[PDB]
Amino acid sequence: MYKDFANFIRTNKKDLLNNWMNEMEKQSDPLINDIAKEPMYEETSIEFVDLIVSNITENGSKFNEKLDDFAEKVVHLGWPIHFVTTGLRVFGLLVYTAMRDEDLFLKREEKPEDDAYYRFETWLSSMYNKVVTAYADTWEKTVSIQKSALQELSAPLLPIFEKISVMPLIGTIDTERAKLIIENLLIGVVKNRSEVVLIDITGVPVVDTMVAHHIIQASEAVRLVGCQAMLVGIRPEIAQTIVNLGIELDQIITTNTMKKGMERALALTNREIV
Amino acid sequence: MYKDFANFIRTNKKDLLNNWMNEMEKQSDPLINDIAKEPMYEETSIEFVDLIVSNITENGSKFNEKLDDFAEKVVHLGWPIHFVTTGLRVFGLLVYTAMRDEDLFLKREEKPEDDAYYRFETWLSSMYNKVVTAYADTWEKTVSIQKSALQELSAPLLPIFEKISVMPLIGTIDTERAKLIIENLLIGVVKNRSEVVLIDITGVPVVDTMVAHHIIQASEAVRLVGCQAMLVGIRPEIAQTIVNLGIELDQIITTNTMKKGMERALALTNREIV
Amino acid sequence: EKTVSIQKSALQELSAPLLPIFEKISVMPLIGTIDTERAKLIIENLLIGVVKNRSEVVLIDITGVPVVDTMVAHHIIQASEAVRLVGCQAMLVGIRPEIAQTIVNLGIELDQIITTNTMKKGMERALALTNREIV
Amino acid sequence: MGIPILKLGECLLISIQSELDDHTAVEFQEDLLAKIHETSARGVVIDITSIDFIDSFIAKILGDVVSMSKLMGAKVVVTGIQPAVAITLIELGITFSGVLSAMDLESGLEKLKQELGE
Amino acid sequence: MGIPILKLGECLLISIQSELDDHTAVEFQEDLLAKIHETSARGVVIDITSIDFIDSFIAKILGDVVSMSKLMGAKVVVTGIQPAVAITLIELGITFSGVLSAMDLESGLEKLKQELGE
């Protein structure tokens, strides 16, 4: 029941204000004091904790949106799950102290029982559950959009010469990225007619054995389509690793920089000198 | 104190097993049953909850590493902060039921008091705090590395012609990305000598007013360095938006596709036809 | 209602036919009196087609429309600017004196639009722009 | 039935449309060998456009065909082996597979014509 | 003191190394005007390599110099206005700033030579 729960929250708000007073000392007092002045944080906290049970015992959609807004605000303000968990712990601690002192539970009785005694904690855990549920929505969404952008940015076949298709491949790549690159390169060479694919391995800091093996597989694959693979821009450590892999390197034609490699490619396709 | 706390955890483990039995019904029973068989999850949970207080009342580094491993395992298994919070709530509920039934607290007395009564909940909140602290480390690290990769992949000036510097610009961009692009383009044109910069706006789905204004600023900036900006690959909606912006478009030389735009650029630098 | 709807659809599809095509040249004849929604349809169809069937120049046959509104003329000029931005000259063809007067009174700047009074002159000038296409 | 052997110019053209595993593979092998033995054409051209899925058996049989009719004349696998089947061919049928022309049968015919003319 | 006016060929060369705000700006203005009025050179060349920070006053004064000596002869701002100062010049000194040569003073001299020869 939510009515007398709010009628006791009208003092539990002061209890939680004292709770914030006690808790400010342990976790980044200067940082929180600088980024958020104390009165507005206190009034936001009492607003979050007082109108949750102002509805008739069931739920509230408007306060659900308010709780989601509070979750995103504490995400932006610099309160991760650790800080919110500390807040819940100190909430419980000061509720314990207040009930040891105030001694006024929900139902009218000379000596209440365990029922409301733990209904309080169940409702505390429920509001914490809703808060943590609203906490991670924006984080998951931004992780997903960043992953999608990284996927679409990994293998740009858009840079295109006349009948030649270069490929930047600047960022560091892993196994997932390697599969994405091989797939995208084959798809791009299928859709667009070309004869030379200029792969720029320049840009990747360190390449292990298996990624280099996939790169050689990509070169052999575009050759087996029927387009020469003029891989360009090899760095020292990556060359050491490729040659230590033991894979044959006679079929791959290499060049130090894009200008010279594409000049050699235009030499290969003689009638593309102009 | 941790000794008799473990001597009562030796039955609170069965209590929490019954807790898991009760809680499996509400949250994705088929999914959790399929991904993780019940006995191993139960033994992992009792291992997590039983050896935490096996040290002498102070702490444990080996079990701290074990708790971090448990946090990463429940992250990978599909238990976000909402599921862990539900687990904490049901932990408290079944501890309440057990103490209502078992009635055996830390200190030897005919009728214990509130001290251990709430020391139990404080320790529960503390282990939950450590769990949530270990929860977000990998997530923050992967967010940071994804952001860094997205930053370094946004504006690749690496694709380079002879005295011409093309720029893919395939993915969608925002204000932060716009600032990154303008900065990187200027830095790249400073380091490398060139005369024509081929910007490929082809690839971005939708461009608002301000990003288009920054693109025009980038064109004017590379012109004011002293290199012609032959912006290429304009789509219909983005052109509509650019022209609706009202910015002057006479200074920018445009082309439909890279091959033709670079052919026009080589026409501009006459002695680069070969 | 069904026949009204299908007839409106027919007028929708008969608005801006880019189908008339020459070698790397396009022309979009429009002859019925146009309105704001029709102007939006024309600009959308012109841009989408010129992207789909990429050609160097585009001829707009304004000849045929008696009178156009000032906002419609402004949108036509914006379409010319946009298709130039894509990389296609908007060689407007055969503008009537009344529409010319309306465009002049509009006060928008009028240098980038290339105009010829007949389709033959516009076609020969377009072939001049693509120098070796004239043969 | 599924092996349309065509002779045009001083060449030979083939299009593949069966994608079956054993029976079509062996019948195509035998028909191609019999045709190339019957009519003497320096260049034979094979199409793999219709196919998008190949196991080990077909890849080995195709490499065998390459060696087979290379023992009597040059050839091109004109049609670009699709990405999935190309990857499978690399991982299992490790070879250069003769001369190739990458999906443009006009390009393959032109290449074979210029190779035979010289 | 900070305005090394050089005359070479049929041109004029300047290098900027003060980066001060008011005094150096005005003295450079007056010295450049007096030199271009004294000696008649069709092309004047200005260097901005040393500078990496410019406020509104210097940008306006530099555009004023461009107009100033453009009223008596063509010019090039040969040295590539650095990215920060280039952005500041765009956002405040909105103009094309004459002919430019992008950090290669040999390129600027060659461009001015070929412009004067024709």
Numbering used by the authors:
A (entry chain o), B (entry chain M): 1 to 274
C (entry chain A): 140 to 274
D (entry chain q), E (entry chain O): 1 to 118
Copy out sentences from the published article reporting this entry, exactly as the authors wrote them.
The stressosome is a pseudo-icosahedral megadalton bacterial stress-sensing protein complex consisting of several copies of two STAS-domain proteins, RsbR and RsbS, and the kinase RsbT. Upon perception of environmental stress multiple copies of RsbT are released from the surface of the stressosome. Free RsbT activates downstream proteins to elicit a global cellular response, such as the activation of the general stress response in Gram-positive bacteria. The activation state of the stressosome is reset by the removal of phosphates from RsbS and RsbR by the phosphatase RsbX, allowing for a new round of phosphorylation.
